[PDB]
Amino acid sequence: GPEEITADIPNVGEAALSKLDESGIVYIGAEVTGGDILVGKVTPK
Amino acid sequence: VTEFLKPRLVDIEQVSSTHAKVTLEPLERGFGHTLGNALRRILLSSMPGCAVTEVEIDGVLHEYSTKEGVQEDILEILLNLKGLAVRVQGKDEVILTLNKSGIGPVTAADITHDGDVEIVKPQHVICHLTDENASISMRIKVQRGRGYVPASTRIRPIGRLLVDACYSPVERIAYNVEAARVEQRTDLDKLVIEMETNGTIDPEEAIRRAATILAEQLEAFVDL
Amino acid sequence: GVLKIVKVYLAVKRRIQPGDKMAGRHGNKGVISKINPIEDMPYDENGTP
User: What the protein does (chain C) (predicted)?
Assistant: First the structure.
């Protein structure tokens, strides 16, 4: 099957997820740093 | 011999609002350059300043956007605000507020100041509203610091904007030595220190501050 | 094959570091090397460094 951009992903603390919105996309104006997550995408498996 | 005349602060010529002069006298031979260079370095180095640190405008999210009604970019407003001059009496941190409507420039005087926060340049321009029914409100954060601090190296909501800190009143320091007119002696020196600050400091206080700083630092070497 | 695409724009401010390459107009390029504090800089008798 395909993969999606769901906001939920495995084996990750909520800390990284704090910046994404319900959809799985970071809010406009957020101040990201090196090694962050911008859009959550999944391994279809 | 084996005794040296102790200099004394003779006069403080407040030649202008900001430009000022100070005179130290007497001074034993050769000490003029020593003390002048030392004090110049100290004054230019470390002085308590009260530069602004954070901003919070009502209807914006990030500094790279624009606001309707105002004819300058948010970055321009922040830049101009960075060059602000102010003094605070008791507290080490304060929050100012600015609200303004109608058309025209926005001087620093438009702040709802309190009795402890004192602006030094009321006429400092900020921005030009170009519509009567266009207002701006903002909260300014003023901290007490020293030297320079880029916003990168410090330590929350998406509305806070962070500027760079430049806590330093002084801008230019020069000095000269010249023979004095003591009752009877030659090769007796007199130091004149010319300073030009941004205007938010008492020169005499600055000199006493630098001197006590230097003495306190130096006292380590004695009694090793 | 592509179901959707999302694009995001980051803004950065490169300020300066020792290592950067600035130059004058007469082919006199150079690499910035150090940032001395003002107090070490040479200054004229008038006080401007």
Answer: DNA-dependent RNA polymerase catalyzes the transcription of DNA into RNA using the four ribonucleoside triphosphates as substrates.
